[model samples]
Target: KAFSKHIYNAYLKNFNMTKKKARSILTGKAPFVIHDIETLWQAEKGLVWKQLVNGLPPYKEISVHVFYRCQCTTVETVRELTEFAKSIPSFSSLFLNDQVTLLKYGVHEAIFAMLASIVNKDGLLVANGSGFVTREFLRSLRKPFSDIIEPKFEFAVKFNALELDDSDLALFIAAIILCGDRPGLMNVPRVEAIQDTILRALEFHLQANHPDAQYLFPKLLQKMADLRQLVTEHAQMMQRIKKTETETSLHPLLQEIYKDM
Candidate 1:
């Protein structure tokens, strides 16, 4: 539990910094979780989402618009997590390649997991919580592209019901990132041991926090498993997007990760 608390505090330290800046981090402030259309339109207006074309935006435009918005958030999410990992003494001790491997594979999984924080059964908040996009609207995008985030939303909605606070999620995200099962791991024993330590801390912390909800510890593990599948699906979808939607640009680091992933 103490180990988990350290992880929690690491996030909290960054979280406190979020308030001093222009934008809020993914958690802890007064967050408006996005779900459904009214909220989405409100989110758009709140973000001052200038329409690419006037009037009810077309499918392709919204697709690209929302994609860019989420992409930036996802980018920042990964960046913050990288900084978070470095703050972890154990994570920083890992070989440079292993750290890269861990982050390369784990960030997206953690992204989708954190994605749940800003999400509900209805949809997710993106563009730094400026825009909330609906699940139905995302699903309506043309093939290859639409498939990209549907699985993550499905996973996020279910994961969101776990009711994890930032403290809870920080450890969970660490566990997600330090996974030994990830391909290209240079030191399986070390990475897996770190993951095990985090898991134990997480379970103990879960019981302390969710004493009445006896199923959560195990359910949390199940969600991690679900996160993996979702990541796999995401890689596949990104591949399809690469192959079919050739015009769409991807983040260079993410693009490289997906190449061999």
Candidate 2:
């Protein structure tokens, strides 16, 4: 079958709705809503550059700095980095698509709405954490603009790494949702709240007993946990950095940024 028909049929089979109903949902006649998740990640090179340049002595300059510090610029490395970034934001796109499919099959708007809220809220927690860790110094530098710019960076990184597993995709989706909703501060409590929301959503979905619910729900749940861990670890690192008193080995520019913040 053609791709469009295949998708339409898949929607019908997946949700047990009719073609007419599906069409209404996709065409926005079924009181369905759509959202665009905006995820942001930092540019490692950019952050390092800012740190190094800002830290140098008044008249001192480094002629060469290694920005792409990875082992090799092979296709695999490129692919790995690319996938890592893409996975961060792809999650939302998948969930949004899933919601659209559910709507097409005449699933209740309330169901989709609930699921959307769960995914969007929780996903933001992980995304925000990742964004902060990636651009910690840069954000500290421009305090006022950090919140706005970090997510843009996060989204850009995720956009570049578009080929990854479903879990990574969900992480990015969640991050973008959160970034769009909140200012650019790395709040651990909020991240925890988002994680809790995801866990609850997974539990609810797992109990639904739809044909594919079992497979999809478990996968999403696992992904949420993985992302939550990533955020948690990063948050801890940030805390440690914040607690340090004396001059440390961190980049001089970063030190300055912290001092300013």
Candidate 3:
């Protein structure tokens, strides 16, 4: 009769455990009860989609447009790209006018165009119309190897099923903003702040009743750690290159400034 026999009974039925064992486990662990409920909720919601492109349309229909302007240098080409971006009403209206400001200052035109596209039309740039743009650009650049990078909708669905709140959304956004862009130039402090936010959110989620919470939290932590390490390594490598440039080179300033990591 104690410990909400209804839930204990349900747990026994779901886990195929004996009533005695279920009761004992429930009594010993406060979190087990929450875990069981969350597990059931998650099961009803179905599996998490881990593959970046699963259920997404095949590569062809995605429609990616990549622009290369070798006729002009990076700055001039970027200006053209920005002017072109301004011409697209769909993109201009959706993103901040200053969105392409990075281009005017110093960002490469090709890269600015690509990133500008992603912010347009409430993500329409990266949603269906221009989503494949990243893939195409990467290919043209002859980037080595390919793996899924986009987040699958299934992950969002599962996360919602777990009843994650605004805090969770904020944490996700911070993580994306920090790591989404290639050639990470994000400052160390900002990146570290996002990492901390994600970790805190994960810890909070673990205390809830989600079925996969136990497994998900650890995995998320590992991912955060991996990303942090990657950023640190990249910074260190850049620093070494900078030092080398000062020590030797025909055009030290040019080598340091124009070199691409």
Candidate 4:
């Protein structure tokens, strides 16, 4: 219970800083959708902010922009989660390598999980919510290149519909990071203990928060499993593309994470 309080406090503190007010200003600002070539060409031609158009071609331009935005979100979110984990005394007590191990594997899982927060059925917010890119638009990119993000949207839209606010999301994110099942974890029992505490707190918190929604906590657990499946399948696809295509370039950090993971 004491650690749970510490956990709750840590969650609240970070939640305010990350979501309630928005950091990395490019997020939450990207608005509307670019669904078609005609619309895409018009946006390139019509923007008063000429720099926004950059000099790239149609799909390349949007693909590059989305990559930058997603990278920014992922990097910042990882930092925030790192800070949160350190603030949790129990988590920080773990071995140094175990901490790194958890973050290395868990960050992407958590990234897409939180990504759902900024997404919807139509499309996800990009460039800090300044530009809204349609799902179909991303799907239309060339093979291997097109393969990177669509699976996330498919998983994310359903995830967002679950309606986990920052509070529950914070706990679920915690559960994800502390999961003992991660490939390289060292102190499995200790990590499992921490996750158990977080899971109980999550269910307890949910009962009061969602009295009519009895199945919510279990579904959240199921989403954690689904997140793993989604990421695993995604990684396999990335591996195939990486092996088969020489010209195809993935972000260095992404490839590194894939290789190291």
Candidate order, lDDT descending: 1, 4, 3, 2
**lDDT-better candidate, 1 vs 3:** 1
- Those runs of model 3 whose alpha carbons end farther than 4 Å from true positions after fitting are 1-131, 134-137, 142-169, 172-201, 206-209, 233-261
Best by TM-score: 1
Query: Candidate 2 vs candidate 3: which has greater TM-score?
Result: 3
Best candidate (score: lDDT): 1
lDDT string, candidate 1, 15-65, tens digits: 322212212434435444445455655666655543322533234554665
TM-score ranking of the models: 1, 4, 3, 2
Per-model TM values vs. the true structure: 0.80, 0.23, 0.27, 0.78
Better of 2 and 4 by TM-score: 4
- Residue-wise C-alpha lDDT for candidate 2, range 1-261, written one tens digit per residue: 132233223223332223233233333431212111111113332232222434432321111111111111111222332232223232234334332222222111112211222122112111111121223433343222233324334333333232232223333233323321222333435544554553454344334433443355555445434433443343344345446522223343223323312
Q: What shift in Å separates residue 217 of candidate 1 from its native position after superposition?
A: 2.0
lDDT value for model 3: 0.31
List the global CA lDDT of all models.
0.71, 0.30, 0.31, 0.70
lDDT comparing candidate 2 with the true structure: 0.30
Question: What lDDT does model 1 reach?
Answer: 0.71
TM-score of predicted model 4?
0.78
What tens digits encode model 4's per-residue C-alpha lDDT throughout 1-261? 455466767877764234443323324433446686676556545433312544322344555554444554565677777888888778889999999888878878888887776666667655444456677887886666677887888887687677566667777888888989877677899999999888998888788667888599889889888888887777787688678764445666667667844
**Which regions in candidate 4 have their CA more than 4 angstroms from the true location?**
1-32, 36-69
Candidate 2 backbone overlaps, count: 20
